[PDB]
Symmetry: D2
Subunit: 239 residues, 4 copies
């Protein structure tokens, strides 16, 4: 398939419902060899069994809050994949008290800090830590949401963190392009269907197929882009 001969690392698999799960299935179907990370002890077993279902046995701990954890993870990866062809960053977090009610009342310096650290900074923390490992032709991908560009109730400081993330995508695409790395995002629709042009919510399958494309040599002409995979929702008003 169109990912044959690519080696891609997939973060963010927590359940069958995760966007990363959908991506990993589409990529496996298209011929990629996959590696997986897991945040913590709680998730390890689930990520192991998914990885085995998709023919992989590279399953490594990584908590992106910690530089040491990211560096250890990539050193472990290096033992099986001394070089590889990019990674999927499918990692977001804000403390729960951030995501309820009026934005100005809910946001705090600490909730802002963590939101941006885990949802935006970690994408470039990963890229720094594996830069010398990426083959020419490599592609990095992260996941954003319309909250980066619109004020959405309750999404609150997560929209600011997604705006920072989308800027990260541009700054990374520019920094890494000369070494043959591309960096993009998918702004996914929520996983309001009567006002979506395609008249349905997007699935992790739709997102997974767009992700596979954006990490493959098919998308060689695309870098620094935030592609809306939301069924046209963001381009409509008042349906």
């Amino acid at each position: 398939g169109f990912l044959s001969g690519k080696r891609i690392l997939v973060t963010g698999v927590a359940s069958k419902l995760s966007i990363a799960y959908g991506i990993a299935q589409a990529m496996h179907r298209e011929g990629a060899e996959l590696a997986f990370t897991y945040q913590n002890d709680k998730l390890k077993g689930r990520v192991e069994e998914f990885a085995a279902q998709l023919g992989s046995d590279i399953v490594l701990q990584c908590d992106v809050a910690e530089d040491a954890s990211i560096d250890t993870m990539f050193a472990e990866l290096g033992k099986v994949w001394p070089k590889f062809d990019g990674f999927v960053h499918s990692i977001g977090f804000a403390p729960g008290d951030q995501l309820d009610g009026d934005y100005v009342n809910a946001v705090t310096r600490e909730g802002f800090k963590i939101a941006h650290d885990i949802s935006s900074y970690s994408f470039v923390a990963m890229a720094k830590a594996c830069r010398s490992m990426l083959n020419p032709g490599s592609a990095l991908l992260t996941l954003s949401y319309l909250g980066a560009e619109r004020a959405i109730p309750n999404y609150n400081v997560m929209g600011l963190a997604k705006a920072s993330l989308e800027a990260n995508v541009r700054y990374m695409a520019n920094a890494m392009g000369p070494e043959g790395v591309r960096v993009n995002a998918i702004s996914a629709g929520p996983i309001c269907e009567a006002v979506t042009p395609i008249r349905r919510t997007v699935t992790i399958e739709d997102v997974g197929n767009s992700a596979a494309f954006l990490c493959s040599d098919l998308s060689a002409g695309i870098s620094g882009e935030v592609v809306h995979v939301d069924g046209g929702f963001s381009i409509a008003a008042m349906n």
Copy 2:
């Protein structure tokens, strides 16, 4: 390949250099059955020989200046493809005097009219004329340029026509989405490489592979989008 079982009509093939040529080759490689149009008597033979190289013998006249020509073309197409799965609109024109020097001095009411008529209106003229022929799952694609969103010297009234075209993409995606049709554009880089993140100009191959994706079921979650296939050029400043 990922277009197997799709029937796609390709406009705009004038030479081996055309973007439509690149698209048609990528689509053929991915398994599509193709049909081609040609503007006029001058181009017919070239388009015939390309179509035969790619295993097609559906080659039909269409001048998008004329409603009758578009309607005749689709009636002819209907004899071999009573239904089909969308089309590639790769058609642009402005009179040559429009594209030289200061924009305000060069533009005229007539040059504006023709620019917008041929570069923007014809995309929806086609969609009107074949609406009842499109299978669910169909996808229409047109080609735009950064001139739609930036003032570029000499591109002049063609930037206004491309802005109209990109709006057309949104309005069409919204109108046709409920019948299972998607409508997108690729904003292609020029066919300034030191300030492009990927450090090279895009080719008709890059554009062709993005086009094949956007007309396939892989891109089911994408509609109303203008995807930049320009190597990240539009997202950079001052390199």
Copy 3:
């Protein structure tokens, strides 16, 4: 006030409810000297009355469909205002059949042509005809709408004409900036409330006050810009 010393031509005053009326009041309040145009002979008496209220006796017929009508009006205006400091373009039209129902069903070649010609081309047609009459520090302003940027039901081909208009603002700003002319648009909110951040619809006073600003030397740093005067409607989602 902040338009003292400035001579501005105001098009498109058709009634007390016109946006151009709110604009003309705001500019007169800030001490601009004003002239007015009117489209045809049914509006003549009433624009004369509006102009007199604003201490102006300069009221000239102009149909922006015709190059000869624009040249004549500017030739007349030159008899009183050999030079002047810009104009407000508050002119929009599409045929009524364009603006109701499914976009792809309603739009026609002729309706697209007339919508783009009157609502977009006319702005640059006016610039062309008065370019040599403009002082250093002049400012041109037109009015646009969110339908340039999103698919809105019924607005249909106006949203394309508006997108062409906003690109016209950029190309015009770029062309004329070197000789000391700025060019901007207001994207005005409809003249609903519960999802607009300011929780009220904008008024012609709101718009007029922004228009006065954009035509005055207070906005000397702003050119080629589309300013949204819509109470924040466009930057909100899902309220």
Copy 4:
């Protein structure tokens, strides 16, 4: 003039070259009553002098790194201004090592944290601390830069902090609009010329005059907006 009756707090006046100085002059000229903050004790004497020139005796220490410093300053401001009509946030910082060389090489977790905290979070930290002191009709303003929207060499992690800042403008406008507060940004040009439409770099006077407008009731229709006061630089390409 058009800020008569308004009480506005101005942060970030550090020298006569500061953007906040150009803003404070423009607002004082238009009859606003002003208060000022300063970051630490080296700036104190000189902000006192600038304030006196502008007929103000209200000059309060505030380090926006600390929640306690913001609360104290607003508690002090309340002794003279139990209510007031908004503030200008003209505060930006990243550590010096963040702003030179390859973005992915320079950025660190701590430099990202400090850049977002001081240049983005502080704008909403101030809003939080004075929300109950604001009159109906109040207006908040911050300063951003094109690096929010494009990858600019060296600006590096500031471009992420700025993108977060502009999203903060939208979320804040959306949250506070219902209680009668507007929130906007200026995206200012660098304070080069040959590709800017107006063919000159913008000045703190240009910026100040736009800031005065955005804080006055003349801009009652504008909220959650990023206004580009960069002479049209951002809307041009390839001059």
